[PDB]
Point group: T
Chain length 151, copies 12
């Protein structure tokens, strides 16, 4: 079995691009996923994506990732970062390294958003850089997996 | 189908009237819905109702509400009020105004029940008035949506 | 005078509808009292109202209520809700059940407004529903003050 | 008017005399005052008593005490003990030593009752001994003002 | 005629023994369930088991337990112990007494693990004794439910 | 010439200057008011003053200020600054800008004196500068009310 | 002995009157004990006394009190008041009502001295009244057992 | 052969099965000890027992256990659980593995009972299962000392 | 420089009026200094000013002030108010009395701004009155150094 | 289409690679700067770098950035992130948008490291991805300044 | 009985060098005492030493010290440092100046070890320097008690 | 050339002996350094000393110390101990073992002084022993660097 990256999107992320005409639209979750997939293909890495509003579905997906041989996870937990011990335990239980990504700056909002049950065990965290944040996580992930020289 | 007002009941609310009715009352969640649907009919307002023990299902329902053009949500999040950021983010993400309702007086109970992830963003909150709390919320909602005669 | 229901308004409620709206509505404390009195009259319920900026005067009114045979109090303590143990102790002392009402949503403002010396002992709490909150409390109260087949 | 000893009863204490807030056990405020006055007369010591539900009235009384040359105050602040820095400041401002008395045991009830704005500045505190707590305070005060042989 | 005792395992428990058996356990969740079932039979007690990564599924199972007349629940809530009031509310709502079990010593890991939404309402708690903890809980339940010995 | 400034003195401020040679000297509250009145006179500004030990009296006075056209309030809340939300709400309610003054340095005393319900809504705060603090507030007020250029 | 009333002195109380009899003057623990024994003898009530610096010795004495049929304990736990749950459990375990006494005013000293493991369970508390606090406690106890009354 | 397990009962446990300790359970401490001894004897393990109300005696006993080569300790610290660092340091100092046991459910009682100075260092913890908790701890301990296979 | 006064401005104060002078105002730090120097000239008092972004420079300047015979310091520590113990220690070390000034109202901004390492040791604090704050501080200082309140 | 990006490195960053590679040795501060400078050159964007151990030097540099017309700051504050209000105020004062970068994962180390005086005002935050974090920040920054490209 | 300097060792210190000496070090408590006695003899000061696992025994020893004429106490309270108010009160009660010593660095260990009931009242504290810490304390004590000048 | 042991004095330490010679003490920073340098020469160890009021200068000096080959640092950070993470990171960055010294007892002064950013990483801490504390730290260092048991 080989090296795959898995991108996990948490609850409410499916909403992206419904705001549309000005404040945040028109960009969508599928648009993000499509860019990442292209980015991965360009490096000859198999990338899969998942989104759910259900915490249990996310946990199940992480469990499947281990059996599937996934090497690294890029996860935007969204609201679940502040609340889900089960998510943290699933990631730890499978021992697949992960990078935490947030489109918005979690630190610029309510104080409860400062707390995370994931960040302390993540390799790294990116927030506030929008969709580029996932790309950055992917770029890092590729180097870690297929290190240094490609030529 | 399509709807103007949506009533959402959180986990365990389905238990109402189901254990020791002589002690705890015969009123069921179904009775509450029946009462509200009739109250809604009196105003020619289309009312939908939803209950689940699963957070993800509630979130999905809320997303569905945006597509349906629901104008207001009446929600009793039950236990989820103190724990679910995901729920708060769904409501905020679809930008549908809501009224928070609890059968019991949350303040009269454990300290952890004092905190809500919804209350600060609600139009208003009602607790401790039992089933009538939902009716009052419905009365307020109808007036806001189709203003008529003030009292 | 003897009354079955007493409505108490706390400090600064006299200002309502005074600095014109904008800043809020034309609704006045008098409009609310008028609306409540009519609602009680329609139910053949005798209702009295009271407002003051003086805490001791409020405590005295509650003491008076006990002698007047008042069965339930609907109180908007306003600012006193966060500060007055004397108010809580008066209500407990006369042992008259009460409903707490706020026009605005107490939870949507400063952190200090989250806390109350009354809420845990109230039958129930209504906030953020404007004037209608008082009407809802009155509606509940009339229903409670009815059967007496209880003991 | 120029008493040696002043006994101040705080808010809601009048309810002992008007018919018990809880309570134990139809001992009235007037009964307490009579006992203290007799105890004071027996020692040839002049004593006055005061009760109010109003913070300002209490503050004014304390100021009046200064002009009257009161040497010690026995005060049962009741609910005010937990809230009134204005009371603390009146007492410190006039520099009259005081003993704090509570009929009930303030530590045996809600956590908020554990805190006082007075107790740190009192000579001493008595709580939970009922009416007898005032008598003890008076006995201590008499010995302090009019020392005699061991008591 | 379904079961007398129900054992619930929380999220991530399905992973037990999954990777990599040489470091840490060989033992699996099915191994645990088989031992408990054997232990139950030996006592002529009907025992059922359930595991899920979804909170709602567990809540549904608990509600189902009431309908089946389950006398006692042995639950390892895992991560959910620190986060789910919904779980707490389900167990209370059905009013089925429970014993809380953890394989590992919850107190020996991060501070957040110290807090439980279940422990205070449990009959008892066992942590850190591994698989034997479930057996111990069963022993206790059997004696409670069918206290074989007259005494 | 319409512009009017109102100075409010809170509880216990009436005591200023009683123990005269040592305790806090000879300056009285009346002395302070005379100086302020004269300072106002020089600037062609109308100024009124008020003191009370009763919170309700102060709140009423503020409400009266709105109707009297008062432009700005200089308030020394004294002990009320730490306790009275009602006071905050009256000032906010009439929307009259205010400056908060204390003779003593609040920060230099008990930790509870560090907190205020007024300071965050004041234009500014002055403490620990004695009676001059009021003059400074007046100087600022006069300039804000009738701004001056080079001359 | 057996006795009806037991007075317990906690650690360091043996020091009273030892150092700089111009520090706290000349009163000793024995002086206090003699005064109490005499006060008890007037009532024909048998009183025992005990002091120790060892927590276990105090717990053992309390247990002994139960067998001896002591009806009330007057206890000055001294330092143990802030630290010993074992003391709290002994008193509750034997179910002998108690009054807590401190010579000094506990609230006037370090913050850590503000918390007691006994006060919430005591009948009453007296502090800051010196040696007289023990006499007051004894007078209350005697009256509880063998009441006399003017009123 | 040849193995000793030591059971330590902390302060106030001597009261068990008497009259009115807080929770009257029928079983005495001796009854508990006799059951444990029999259980150990079945495994050809020696079971030492110790109870004291004195912390120092317990600390000395632990030191003694090290000199005597005790394999494991089962300890119910009772009230000392929440207060004694010295106990934790004794167990750590001798490095004898231990299991912490409580008859009652520590989590169900005052918040101060929630904290243990031993739990984080224990192999495991059992609480609220009454006398059976000690037996369970012993069963685990024997298996740890004497793994079944091969004798 | 006799009866010298020293004015110290902390980090970032150099920016005053630099950016968006419309919108934010055009008063500059130099303008403030020139005003203070002139105000000082009028009273025949020597005054110096200092600003730095460097804590060490400020500490050195304070040390220098003692040797220079500076009699009072007027300081706006800016950001350093909430972070520098070193500043507090420098001012305390030289024993030069000081007044703390801020242009803006520190209490109306983030919670972290509510704490000062200076305020408890200043004679007084002025905040939120802008440039005039420095002038008021100077006005007080002159009276204190060279009192001419009386002609 | 050329602009100015400024990279700021905080205290102790100058140590990178200077001891015991591999601890995580080898990579130096200059190596990071060369990579960034090269990365900027490829975009035809002008980039400057600064490192210092002195907070004042950093504050000065940031002020200079304003005069220089710097568009965006990429800053690794290092230790200053948890301590420097002066730094926060400098960036806000000049109003230059910034991205916060940390080589290591701040969330994975002592609790004090979890708090930043910058993060809430940052566009975004990157931590734990090492040197790459700076490049990602630069990539985002380039797109921000010069959006229109072959992309 | 009779010594100028008294060294007190708290609970568990008797274990030093007891187990795994090769692992943990061979130094024993007697070795430490022997060094100190020798250092004392060199300076012609009498020194006594004491160790116990019982708090009461330590308190009694301190009391004895007053009568003995001890001038200074060097105490390593060990675990009792974090828990014993009684110890603090004993030292204060006899008013013997003391120095607090710990072999290990308390600040490097769990958070609860960061608080001492003695540190605030000690002349000084030494921790983490092992046995030498006692010697340093002794060196300071000698210089304090006896004039530096030999002969 | 270069030192083996380096002594660092923090901000304000330069003031020692400057003011209040009779009240303060007339020992200066130079006296301490000369004593240390002599103590060092006496063991044939080179010792360098440094003081600054500038955190950056201190950090730079520590960096220099690594390249110099300094074996150990004795540091009195003074006020910086409570605020300077940069200082902690410098000492850790160079990996030079350090002992933390304070002339005064930090524990006896404000609560904020109780926390240190160095203490947990120091070998040891000495405070409150005046100048001797530095000498004691040196004595430990010399023994650590050149032990005399090998000899």
């Amino acid at each position: 079995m080989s090296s795959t990256i898995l991108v996990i999107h948490g609850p409410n992320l499916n909403l992206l691009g419904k705001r549309e005409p000005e404040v945040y639209g028109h960009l969508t979750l599928d648009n993000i996923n499509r860019q990442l997939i292209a980015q991965a293909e360009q490096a000859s890495i198999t990338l899969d994506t998942f989104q759910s509003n259900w915490e249990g579905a996310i946990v199940d997906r992480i469990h499947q990732a281990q059996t599937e041989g996934v090497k690294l996870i890029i996860i935007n937990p969204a609201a679940l970062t502040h609340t889900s011990v089960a998510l943290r335990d699933a990631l730890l239980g499978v021992a697949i390294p992960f990078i935490e990504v947030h489109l918005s700056n979690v630190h610029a909002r309510e104080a409860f958003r400062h707390h995370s049950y994931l960040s302390d065990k993540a390799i790294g965290v990116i927030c506030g850089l929008g969709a580029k944040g996932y790309s950055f996580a992917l770029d890092y992930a590729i180097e870690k997996i297929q290190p240094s020289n490609p030529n």
